[PDB]
Amino acid sequence: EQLTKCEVFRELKDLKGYGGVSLPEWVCTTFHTSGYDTQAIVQNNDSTEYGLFQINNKIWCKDDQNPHSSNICNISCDKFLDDDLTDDIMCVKKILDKVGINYWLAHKALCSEKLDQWLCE
């Protein structure tokens, strides 16, 4: 699903503030990460990123490409492609626990200064 800036904002309510990170920062990051596309798939030679956040099949989820994935989030990857972001978001809550917000390099580079433009209302 192609999402609008405000749909995102709405659907990441449960991520709001988590690890000190704010929804504009999330909007700004999800945008640069996926262009608000919950079904984006980038399959590289060796790993593959899924969904609104682009979670790679080599650490967090499991797929046919990397069966020796840790599967930290205990979950099949194609679940990060559907329109339901409930599981998408608990995975990402782990990633914050274990690495944190700089795991996404876009955030500090682009989602830190001008958060006004990522607010919904």
Interface with Zn ion by CB under 5 A: which residues?
82, 84, 88
Task: Write down the least CB distance from residue 60 to Zn ion, Å.
Answer: 13
Q: Is 49 or 88 the residue whose CB approaches Zn ion more closely?
A: 88
Any binding-site annotation on 82?
A: yes
Torsion of Cα atoms, 28 then 34 then 36 then 40, to 10°: -170
Any binding-site annotation on 46?
A: no
Task: Write down the least CB distance from residue 33 to Zn ion, Å.
Answer: 14
Q: Is 53 or 118 the residue whose CB approaches Zn ion more closely?
A: 53
Say if CB 103 and CB 95 are below 8 A apart: yes
Any binding-site annotation on 97?
A: no
Beta strands in the chain (DSSP E): 41-43, 48-50, 55-56
Q: Is 63 or 88 the residue whose CB approaches Zn ion more closely?
A: 88
Task: Write down the least CB distance from residue 120 to Zn ion, Å.
Answer: 21
Q: What is the DSSP string of 48-93?
A: EEETTTTEETTTTSB-SS-TT---TT-SBGGGGSSS--HHHHHHHH
Say if CB 63 and CB 77 are below 8 A apart: yes
Residue nearest to Zn ion (CB): 88
Task: Write down the least CB distance from residue 82 to Zn ion, Å.
Answer: 4
**Residue stretches of the annotated binding site for Ca(2+):** 79, 82, 84, 87-88
